Design a protein that fits this description.
Radius of gyration of chain A: 21 Å
Function (chain A): Part of the ACTR1A/ACTB filament around which the dynactin complex is built. The dynactin multiprotein complex activates the molecular motor dynein for ultra-processive transport along microtubules.
CATH topology of the largest domain in chain A: Actin, Chain A, domain 4
Protein name (chain A): Alpha-centractin
Shape of chain B: elongated
CATH class of the largest domain in chain A: Alpha Beta
Number of domains of chain A: 2
Strand content of chain B: under 5%
Shape of chain A: globular
Organism (chain A): Sus scrofa
Distance between the termini of chain A: 30 Å
Strand content of chain A: under 5%
Order of helices and strands of chain B: HH
CATH architecture of the largest domain in chain A: Alpha-Beta Complex
Number of helices of chain A: 12
Number of strands of chain B: 0
Structural class of chain B: mainly alpha
Structural class of chain A: mainly alpha
Helix content of chain B: 10-25%
Largest sheet of chain A: 2 strands, antiparallel
Strand order of the largest sheet of chain A: 1-2
Order of helices and strands of chain A: HHHEEHHHHEHEHHHH
Oligomer: part of a larger assembly
GO molecular function (chain A): ATP binding
Distance between the termini of chain B: 81 Å
Radius of gyration of chain B: 36 Å
Subcellular location (chain A): Cytoplasm, Cytoskeleton; Cytoplasm, Cytoskeleton, Microtubule organizing center, Centrosome; Cytoplasm, Cell cortex
Number of strands of chain A: 4
């Protein structure tokens, strides 16, 4: 959706594009020529440089502050017209449902994951966010490997390599006997 | 004409400009359109008196206080 909003950016810039193949290139920029900052309004007022991206063709494609302006929506969901509270506050709500003692652990135990989370000072900006959210004397600690994708793949590579895992998996014939509701009991 | 008189080789009886005697919407008529006039002065005087207040209706890539609304003030 952020990339689609970047296609909106394109039309505002004048880039007349509406294909999914073009969308792929936008995602290539997203992972490539798109970062984060920590100052929203400050850098918004700050004059940009309009980073000229170059196509496989090599066409000049200026960016501006849009590269980090579009992920502000991830923290400001109403920019797309969607009521939510932003990643930070939603996680804080998850914290609210936990307990004060366990909360401190979770401040120290933050597992950022997902490739979408790969940005310049992504977690650092989010650190500042939660620092403005969490109270004083709260030590927030993030854990976010460089493989925030394969962490799941390697975790499944380990879990799948278990012997107790027999009960964890579901046999073929089992589902073939009665149904998936048995596995829905197994999924919780 | 005087040139015609003074020039011997120039013959006459010529209908000079020889010519050929030549001899000489639905969309509104549909089963569902309702083309209506708003009565420009009537609706104009109607909405005209309806004052509109504005206070810096500013939006273009402006970051700070996510929700915004045009014609901010009241009148």
């Amino acid at each position: 959706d952020v990339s689609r909003f970047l296609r909106l950016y394109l039309r505002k810039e004048g880039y007349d594009f509406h294909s999914s193949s073009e969308f792929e290139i936008v995602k290539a920029i997203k992972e490539r020529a798109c970062y984060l900052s920590i100052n929203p309004q400050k850098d918004e007022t700050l004059e940009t440089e309009k980073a000229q991206y170059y196509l496989p063709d090599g066409s000049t494609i200026e960016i501006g502050p849009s590269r980090f302006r579009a992920p502000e929506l991830l923290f400001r969901p109403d920019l797309i017209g969607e009521e939510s509270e932003g990643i930070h506050e939603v996680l804080v709500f998850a914290i609210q449902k936990s307990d004060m003692d366990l909360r401190r652990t979770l401040f120290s135990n933050i597992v950022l994951s997902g490739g979408s989370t790969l940005f310049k000072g992504f977690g650092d900006r989010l650190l500042s966010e939660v620092k403005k959210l969490a109270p004083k004397d709260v030590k927030i600690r993030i854990s976010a490997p460089q493989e925030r994708l394969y962490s799941t793949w390697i975790g499944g590579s380990i879990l799948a390599s278990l012997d107790t895992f027999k009960k964890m998996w579901v046999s073929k014939k089992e589902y073939e006997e009665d149904g998936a509701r048995s596995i829905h009991r197994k999924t919780f | 004409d005087p040139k015609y008189a003074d020039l011997p080789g120039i013959a006459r009886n010529e209908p000079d400009v020889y010519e050929t005697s030549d001899l000489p919407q639905e969309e509104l008529t549909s089963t569902s359109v309702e083309h209506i006039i708003v009565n420009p002065n009537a609706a104009y005087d109607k909405f005209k008196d309806k004052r509109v207040g504005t206070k810096g209706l500013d939006f273009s890539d402006r970051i700070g206080k996510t929700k915004r609304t045009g014609y901010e003030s009241g009148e």
